[PDB]
Design a protein around this ligand. Structure first.
Ligand code: CA
Ligand code: CA
Ligand code: CA
Lengths: 330, 190, 183
């Protein structure tokens, strides 16, 4: 298959947006499962958020084409026509024009079968009082969380960008809200359900103190956007690509952040009451899998919520339901 | 949008609060029906003034003055004459003294049909009974002879005051049944 | 004016500002200190404004069932199942319907009837509202809730509404009766 000219991303020759546009019947007829849904709130005139930065990681060339997650964007069509010039090079992409609040759209999209629903807004970041700015995203989150499905609801995986951090309190129930708590201690942030730009601000200070650490995070979060790709994009000709040489195609073995479950397979012996340090040493030795944290259920005794534990102690006890964040090559 | 975010904030703080909200636009109602913890069976409600406005005037297309008949029932008013009023204004204003009230029918109504209960309320009690809560449970408006008054049935009355409708709760087929003036119907007739 | 008129056309107007009701009619004796509900255009059913709805908030608190009553009447029957279906955003779904659901076509409706002719005209000919009420309920199951009477009894086609008259209230042969009915 074809790749970007630097090997790093899967690539498709251009198309018109109408090759990827779908109505509700076409979306519903499509086998959408394990996909990514983008609930895009935009007006036709609103500024370009650069959804390429969302899609490009989802198309890292170190994935095989059969394990690339399909992507469907639900949103304003007139906005998407001016976003599209950047998106038109990515495969397995589709658009359902209309509001993400319309439960019809969501059902055609098989919202209950996605691996992630992303809620994102292009709107004006001070359009009214700080109580109204995220109402579209909060109503969309609550709407999806309230849907029921035939053979659900709060089991749909969500992540929402917030324009105003203090709105995070409305994003979840069974929560014990307090406006004096900073975003990083709140349950929706601790569960990976919320995001906001304010947690990025110390990228300025870390960019000064160690430049290489800012390149590390990038190679991970972008899926591999090297300065050569940034130069190619700065030529304005779009993302150039094609069939690529074995010399550049060697870079398809980048390291990726993955998540694995202790419920089954060779590591389940550690999930059955072992310790994180036993798991770490075993997984690294046998598989080269380097473990960086856990994703544990909050309700250990109810809900599907999970919290993230960066770098546990060596003697930290495991549960058979834990999932492990890992760095891996295959 | 501002009022929906207040409902969301209240329901985020505690789900089980009965919330009643005034909405200006009908299409905005769908957004709060979709809140996870909104429940009309728990008594949450949206008074949509656009829905109600157009509903009242649309009933005037079916019955020409009915928007006035009906809107006067939903505001508390007491009739207060002043000598400069013409006859039609006094007739009208006495009619505005009415509101719609809910009260339990006394055991004296048990096993009457709704028509007998309505004849009895109008003729003896001076109360216009027009509907009942049939025991889940459901509201029935002007139900036919097939429907009996069950024990402890809540009735819906048009009357001048809550002090009037109490008479339906205190009426007794032995103690009060011969009373000529409704002011004497009182005190549970024990 | 119309060829084989004018003030005889039946009108209802929504007003955005209640105090504009004074311009809506002539032969009227306007006064800006009178609240909307006492004005002739409101008393005749010719005007409406959102301000008369505001105590739906207080009545919604004091008795929830009474707010459902008014709704079943004014909406013609929009149950919370229809509101749920509309909240799915798919539009109002419909088709041919089963005899089990089609049984609900006998809802009670607010209707208006005239004492000028037919079986009730005997009461219009100088009877009393309580005689009419008891007769209509007994013979027809028709439950009477008020009258719609001409203002000029001696000229204009205007009529005023009288909610729940006394038992001994005199009828006129030109009166129309507000009723609840099944057919
Ligand atoms: Ca909360
Ligand atoms: Ca009163
Ligand atoms: Ca006037």
């Amino acid at each position: 298959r074809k790749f970007d000219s630097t090997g790093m991303f899967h690539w498709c020759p251009d198309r018109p947006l109408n090759d990827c546009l779908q109505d509700r019947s076409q979306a519903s007829a499509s086998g959408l499962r394990n996909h990514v849904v983008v609930c895009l709130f935009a007006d036709a005139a609103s500024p370009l958020i650069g959804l390429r930065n969302l899609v490009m990681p989802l198309r890292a060339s170190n994935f095989h084409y059969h394990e690339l997650k399909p992507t469907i964007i639900v949103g304003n069509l007139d906005y998407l026509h001016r976003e599209w010039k950047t998106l038109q090079n990515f495969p397995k992409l589709s658009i359902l024009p209309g509001s993400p609040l319309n439960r019809a759209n969501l059902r055609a999209v098989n919202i209950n079968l996605c691996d992630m629903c992303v809620i994102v807004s292009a709107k004006d970041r001070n359009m009214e009082d700080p109580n109204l700015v995220d109402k579209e995203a909060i109503l969309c989150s609550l709407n999806i969380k309230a849907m029921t499905f035939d053979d659900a609801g709060a089991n749909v995986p969500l992540i929402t960008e917030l324009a105003n951090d203090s709105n995070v309190q409305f994003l979840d129930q069974d929560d014990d809200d307090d406006p004096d708590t900073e975003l990083y201690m709140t349950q929706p942030f601790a569960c990976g359900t919320a995001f906001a730009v304010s947690v990025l601000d110390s990228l300025m200070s870390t960019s000064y103190f160690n430049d290489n650490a800012l390149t590390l995070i990038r190679t991970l979060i972008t899926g591999g956007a090297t300065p050569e790709l940034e130069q190619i994009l700065a030529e304005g000709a779009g993302m150039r690509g094609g069939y690529c040489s074995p010399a550049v195609l060697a870079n398809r073995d980048r390291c990726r952040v993955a998540q694995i479950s202790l419920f089954d397979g060779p590591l389940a012996q550690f999930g059955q009451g072992g310790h994180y340090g036993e798991l770490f040493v075993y997984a690294l030795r046998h598989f080269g899998i380097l473990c960086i944290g856990l994703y544990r259920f909050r309700d250990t005794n109810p809900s599907s919520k999970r919290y993230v534990i960066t770098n546990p102690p060596e003697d930290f006890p495991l549960l058979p339901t834990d999932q492990v964040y890992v760095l891996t090559y295959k | 949008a501002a009022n929906i975010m207040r409902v969301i904030s209240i329901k985020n703080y505690h789900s089980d609060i009965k919330v009643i909200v005034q909405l200006l636009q009908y299409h905005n109602k769908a957004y709060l029906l979709n809140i996870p913890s909104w429940d009309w069976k728990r008594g949450d409600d949206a008074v949509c003034v656009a829905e109600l406005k157009l509903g009242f005037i649309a009933q005037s297309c079916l019955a020409p003055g009915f928007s006035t008949l009906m809107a006067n029932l939903f505001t508390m008013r007491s009739y207060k004459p002043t000598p400069e009023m013409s006859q039609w204004q006094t007739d009208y204003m006495r009619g505005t003294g009415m509101e719609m009230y809910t009260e339990y029918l006394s055991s004296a109504f048990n096993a009457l049909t709704f028509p007998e209960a309505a004849e009895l309320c109008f003729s003896k009690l001076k109360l216009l009974l027009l509907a009942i809560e049939v025991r889940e449970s459901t509201l029935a408006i002007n139900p036919g002879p097939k429907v009996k008054i069950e024990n402890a049935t809540q009735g819906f009355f048009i009357a001048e005051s809550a002090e009037e409708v109490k008479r339906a709760f205190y009426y007794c087929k032995n103690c009060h049944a011969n009373v000529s003036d409704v002011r004497q119907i009182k005190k549970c007739k024990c």
